[PDB]
Structure 1
Amino acid sequence: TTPIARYRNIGISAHIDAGKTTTTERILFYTGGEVHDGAATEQERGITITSAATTAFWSGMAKQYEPHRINIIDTPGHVDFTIEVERSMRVLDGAVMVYCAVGGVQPQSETVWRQANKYKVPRIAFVNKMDRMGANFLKVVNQIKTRLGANPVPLQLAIGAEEHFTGVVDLVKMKAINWNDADQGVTFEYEDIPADMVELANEWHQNLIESAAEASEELMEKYLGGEELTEAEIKGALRQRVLNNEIILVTCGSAFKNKGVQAMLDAVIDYLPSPVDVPAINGILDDGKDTPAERHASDDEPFSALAFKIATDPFVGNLTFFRVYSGVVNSGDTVLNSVKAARERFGRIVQMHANKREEIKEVRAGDIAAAIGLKDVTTGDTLCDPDAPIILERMEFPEPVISIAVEPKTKADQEKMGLALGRLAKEDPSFRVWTDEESNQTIIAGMGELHLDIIVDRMKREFNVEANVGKPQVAYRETIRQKVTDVEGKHAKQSGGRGQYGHVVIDMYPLEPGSNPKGYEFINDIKGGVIPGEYIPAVDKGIQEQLKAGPLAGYPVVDMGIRLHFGSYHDVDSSELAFKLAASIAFKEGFKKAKPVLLEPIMKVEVETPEENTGDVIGDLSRRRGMLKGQESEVTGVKIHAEVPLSEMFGYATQLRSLTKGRASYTMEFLKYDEAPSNVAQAVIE
């Protein structure tokens, strides 16, 4: 019942709104008496439905034929989930790239493709919209060639066009099928190739036999004579060529109209690779100096798995999904977590099915499931129960550029918000949690609106947390622009049943720039005991403490050099306490006296935006009151460099993704602090 060669871990990947969900739901229907069950049967729902792995069966014949189990990997809770696609590729063997036949430019559809090549994972294309208007198989095969350079080979040709789409022709076996129904697909019949299409069928057929003879002199000789290289080999030749990332078999149909889907499943079996058709996963031994070794998928060899997803369960609890690459993981055994250093107790194994849970005794190599128990195991960690020194891997890092302040309306929400982050950080280790330096709030950073949009929903509900879901907030820095003309510091009070006295004069001037944090600088010009040295330290602390709060908005004072030139001591006082205070008032007076001004952080921005949305990103930056430095050309795109107030960056993240469908991306780094804009300088005081 558990054949490694008949396993098919897949993942539906395509541009957003291209048809990933629809195609997945249909594959679950055809593959899934549970059939008539669901037949006769929005964010929360869209989230619940999708489950880790959804198994099912498909075999041309119940007996005397080859049956196959198709594990449809998904969950990617986000558009063209690069983070969920990447990890799913490493954890797997194959994928299916769905293209929007009507979708003209389908620019971000390139994002999901880059991930495929990123993890060198074989894939098959599927033009999902043949029924729709503008539904053009050719347009999909031409753009895939020019823009994606994926070297597509035509396997299927559409019968009829748009509305008149009634059938599909299998070009490999030279035979077609007709669908008597426009829905529910309850009528399919093996029909011969019609007339007005026979000629076109023979052309591509010899075009297909031509492609399956390239990388081989033997195949070459037969191609010349026209001799058909054995079929079992034409499927094996195309299979060998698709597994070695040299060609991409293309299929067609309409997931919605229920057409060509079944032929698509056959393609998955006939061409898509299994856990064995992919190079042994690599790793590093813990000897410091590398020693990389390949992990052959042998069930009897020493086990080695990779946890790729921690998941809180309203029932069983913490669940750590894994991908057994070697050996076997048994229930009731002890495994060694080498990334850390301790034995973990494995309580039970469990596979996630479409509707129910199944308790099993074991999970051999090449298989996947959930593991209850394991308290200290996180994502990325590697486990090895046979003692085979574990190894590790990680060759990337996710970006943010988006942070959201979150003042839980109460302390009760502050605590459950910390759990909503630390518990969801194990799953999505891309974001980061902090505390605003000049505020004291919770800041969550991500990749997009919907990302934090659903995260917020997961907080207020799942963790019950009503809060003033923040948007932009403010900060600021301050400094003077001109030299002080005098400013003294007199502190004389009979507060203490004893007199208190302190007298200091100081020349504080705006300070020069510098790489180091030395924005502050003190100098003692006291020439002749005017001020006793026993209290110079006092005045230094008095000043220091006051810099912590400015007059404009009570924020730390920086970039200033303070000098002391004159003072004196008196009849009873003269104490570290006396002159400490004597320094406080002197600073407050000076800062307010030397023309105060705000200092906002300026960021260095690099915007990649197609080659076509380039001019659009420039204009947008110019309007954001930024200052263009110059644009760099990268590939068929452009990188725009410029300075723009983190202040005024306000929403560029999304405004930029809006004019690019996400085509564009950007990175933001701190550069320097500059003097604010008059208009903003007035709004700060309060």
Structure 2
Amino acid sequence: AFTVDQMRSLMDKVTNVRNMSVIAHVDHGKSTLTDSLVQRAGIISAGITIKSTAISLYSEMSDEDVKEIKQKTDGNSFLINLIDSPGHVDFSSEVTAALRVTDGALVVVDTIEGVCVQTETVLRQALGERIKPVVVINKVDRALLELQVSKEDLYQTFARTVESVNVIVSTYADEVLGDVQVYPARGTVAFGSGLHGWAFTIRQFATRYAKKFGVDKAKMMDRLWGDSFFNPKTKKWTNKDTDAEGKPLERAFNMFILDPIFRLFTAIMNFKKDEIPVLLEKLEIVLKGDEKDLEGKALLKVVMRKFLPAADALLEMIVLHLPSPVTAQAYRAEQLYEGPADDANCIAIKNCDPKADLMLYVSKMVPTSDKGRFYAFGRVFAGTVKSGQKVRIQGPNYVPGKKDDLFIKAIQRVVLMMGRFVEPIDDCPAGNIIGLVGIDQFLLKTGTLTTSETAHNMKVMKFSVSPVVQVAVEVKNANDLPKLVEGLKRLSKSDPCVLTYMSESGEHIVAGTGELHLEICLQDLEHDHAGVPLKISPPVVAYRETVESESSQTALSKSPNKHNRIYLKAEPIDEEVSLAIENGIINPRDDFKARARIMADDYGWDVTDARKIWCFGPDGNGPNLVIDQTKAVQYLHEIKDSVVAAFQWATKEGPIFGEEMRSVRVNILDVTLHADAIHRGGGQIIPTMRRATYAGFLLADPKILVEIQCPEQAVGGIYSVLNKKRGQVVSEEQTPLFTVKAYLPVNESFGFTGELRQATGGQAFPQMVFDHWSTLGSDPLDPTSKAGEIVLAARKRHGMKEEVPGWQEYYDKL
């Protein structure tokens, strides 16, 4: 328990600060280990609550210990920031943000399961942020109590886990950092049980046996690990696991560190009441008061805590091995900074200069209980932030030259983020973590605060990070729509990985990283964010209505008056041309002459046909066209508007089932009008043109990029799944992983992410973006073909008659 003054004083000696987090696969004990750290060294101040985001720890080392620290140290006190990290491990950007504000990591690995993909994933991301790792092989108690494992087997298991870890490290760690691997002999590996409060380092045992073996601990800790044997018969230390006679010698680690522990367990758990007092006396362990009465596990737990306090082992690796901001920002500056490496702000970052202009990185927005307000969480890399300070908020798209994402505003309050609570403070210098209140509106997720007009903006790991799982959300009670629209905004702001947008069919879409993520999101949206009954369902897929060939015969239709007739034929527009229209090469408003030269000279069109396009559709700019091929129609100019209008109507609502047309060309062959404009009026010709178009359409044979990263041996699962879902491989490139690109029909992608991890052993990571429109060859009018099934389902869903009206229905015989 410290006062604000004590905390602030502790924060001045950044040489004695440690910014880190705990990396662990679910169930490996990440939580119980941090509870242990918090109970042993947690810091607390001597009605606003927040979500616990970081915890402060306090530690003191002995004068000798502090001498061993291979880095700038000021005194024997240390402040440790245990920063919370998300649990989604899909190589998400929320995780990268959290790691970015840390410099070291405590990696938890299970004794039995060893290193699992989740572990490798966060560690890999961590290494990408030049974070230094330290390991704890947890759940050791399981191997002794459940599995009855032997000493040499336990050893071997430990050694294999350490090797698996240094494979990931040696693979992804920047060569410039040197050897960032982990070595038990160097004290960067702890072994223990987070559930039961004991742990140790070889160093602690070396200290314990040095002044006893008549040898300095430097010599002792080298002998207490690996291939060092002490032959009691010769009283000598050797590196051979056998003696002269060739008899088996027990490894020093087993003989001096494990055996005492093994004997304590065996004696206490078997109630050997005449063997326990002696053993405890020899190890100099003292039971006091009610403890003298304990037996079994209760006695064990209490005896091991006294013999080798868990937190103690962990804090030792954290203080002695994890790096302190002054040291790190020196080699992290350039990556962190987008600007010039010679830039005044980059230098201020390298020097962690508190007197320079401000360079504060906003890691994320954190939910508070202050009625819908989110506080900005981040780290001061340069300068110092102050309450009521005028600063420049620069979003993800800001550029020193443009005024995009820029937001100048005063910072209302600077707060210490201590668990679920906050503590207003006046300022905070470079090198520290901190929370800002009042930045809500201007920033959602990451950003960059600066006090320099020149200041450039700041930058991300082997869990899903793409919103591949999506559903349509709608209120059960129409009148609630306002709360839903508002809830989505609240939901989006609180979750970086969540996405919401309106679909082409008018449905609110909410998409999540994975099925589980999406579920939390929907629960929170419905219960809190919107707080209203929501209805969840799949997204409706949009289709296009096109033609495969020219009308098998001239389409003929008359007006209601029966006085006017339009003769036309429909034909396919080439994909390259549709694409050209959709993407800007061929435009509705371009000069008809130059456009026609392009369509003719570059796309094979007849220049007269091109010069005569009457309109594009739908919406006046779609990839469908009306070309005039009439020769001597007297009042043509007068019906043009009606014909154009009818086309916008026809191409917007196709005759197959109401979807928009695409790649449809309509040629007006001839028009016969009444002499008097009265009967030639839009109300007569608009229906005629639309009726004729539908007829020409139906007479023209009507019809309606998934990138995966993964290991070689896993690629086979990808092809396996794709083949089960009308998929098609596109490209297989590559000394990282592999990346398979393929086309996957959208209506075959629901649950895909699941079947893929299942077929690749959870090693494949999908990514999907809409690519193309593709023409289904089956008959849209045949209720049993692939296209027809889709058409029949949409028709029933819209309450239309099942049978699709045929062309004869729009043809008016002469």
* Corresponding residue of 1:12: 22
* Corresponding residue of 2:569: 507
* Corresponding residue of 1:57: 58
* Corresponding residue of 2:266: none
Does 1:153 find its partner at 2:183? Answer: yes
% identity of equivalent residues? 25
**Counterparts in 2 of 1:21-420, with a 5 A limit?**
21-32=31-42, 51-60=52-61, 66-79=76-89, 82-103=92-113, 106-133=116-143, 136-146=157-167, 148-149=169-170, 151-155=181-185, 170-175=201-206, 202-203=222-223, 260-280=310-330, 281-282=333-334, 293-294=346-347, 295=349, 296-315=351-370, 317-337=373-393, 343-354=408-419, 356-374=421-439, 376-378=441-443, 379-385=445-451, 389-394=454-459, 399-411=466-478, 413-420=480-487
Q: What SS is found at the alignment partner of 2:162?
A: helix
Does 1:532 find its partner at 2:553? Answer: no
Contact 2:193 2:199 in 1 (8 A): no
Instruction: Pick from 747, 752, 768 the counterpart of residue 652 of structure 1.
Output: 752
Instruction: Pick from 506, 522, 531 the counterpart of residue 456 of structure 1.
Output: 522
Shift of 1:61: 6.9
Does 1:674 find its partner at 2:784? Answer: no
* Corresponding residue of 2:560: 492
* Corresponding residue of 1:238: none
* Corresponding residue of 2:258: none
1:52 aligned partner, one-letter code: T
Measured in 1, the distance between the counterparts of 2:581 and 2:95 equals: 42
Instruction: Give the count of matched residue pairs.
Output: 596
Measured in 2, the distance between the counterparts of 1:659 and 1:454 equals: 25
Shift of 1:429: 4.1
User: More displaced, 167-176 or 343-352?
Assistant: 167-176
Measured in 2, the distance between the counterparts of 1:523 and 1:80 equals: 52
1:78 aligned partner, one-letter code: H
* Corresponding residue of 1:183: none
* Corresponding residue of 2:513: 447
1:137 aligned partner, one-letter code: F
User: More displaced, 391-400 or 286-295?
Assistant: 286-295
Could you list the per-position Cα deviations for residues 141-186 of structure 1 after superposition, in whole angstroms to 9, with x for gaps in the alignment? 12123455363322369999999x9975532354489xxxxxxxxx
- In structure 2, relative to structure 1, the CA distance for the partners of 1:49 and 1:470 (3 Å cut) is farther
- In structure 2, relative to structure 1, the CA distance for the partners of 1:622 and 1:408 (3 Å cut) is same
Indicate the structure (1 or 2) with the bigger Cα radius of gyration: 2
2:112 aligned partner, one-letter code: V
Q: What SS is found at the alignment partner of 2:718?
A: helix
* Corresponding residue of 2:708: 607
2:672 aligned partner, one-letter code: S
- In structure 2, relative to structure 1, the CA distance for the partners of 1:191 and 1:454 (3 Å cut) is farther
2:58 aligned partner, one-letter code: F
Task: Give the RMSD, CA atoms, in angstroms.
Answer: 4.0
Q: In proportion to residue count, which structure has more helix?
A: 2
Measured in 1, the distance between the counterparts of 2:392 and 2:556 equals: 69
Contact 1:526 1:566 in 2 (8 A): yes
Q: Tell me, which stretches of 5 or more residues in structure 1 are unaligned? A: 36-47, 178-188, 194-198, 209-253, 494-499, 599-603
Shift of 1:389: 4.2
Contact 1:13 1:85 in 2 (8 A): no
Shift of 1:559: 1.2
2:352 aligned partner, one-letter code: A
* Corresponding residue of 1:584: 690
Shift of 1:50: 6.0
* Corresponding residue of 1:217: none
- In structure 2, relative to structure 1, the CA distance for the partners of 1:585 and 1:459 (3 Å cut) is same
Q: Tell me, which stretches of 5 or more residues in structure 2 are unaligned? A: 1-8, 67-74, 148-153, 172-180, 214-218, 229-300, 399-404, 583-622, 779-784, 796-814
Measured in 2, the distance between the counterparts of 1:651 and 1:537 equals: 48
Contact 1:406 1:468 in 2 (8 A): yes
Instruction: Pick from 525, 547, 550 the counterpart of residue 483 of structure 1.
Output: 550
Could you list the per-position Cα deviations for residues 341-360 of structure 1 after superposition, in whole angstroms to 9, with x for gaps in the alignment? 55423333322334644333
* Corresponding residue of 1:547: 651
Shift of 1:536: 3.4
Measured in 2, the distance between the counterparts of 1:114 and 1:286 equals: 26
* Corresponding residue of 1:211: none
Q: What SS is found at the alignment partner of 1:591?
A: helix
* Corresponding residue of 2:581: 517
Does 1:626 find its partner at 2:727? Answer: yes
2:386 aligned partner, one-letter code: N
Could you list the per-position Cα deviations for residues 109-134 of structure 1 after superposition, in whole angstroms to 9, with x for gaps in the alignment? 22212212222222222222323347
User: More displaced, 470-479 or 447-456?
Assistant: 470-479
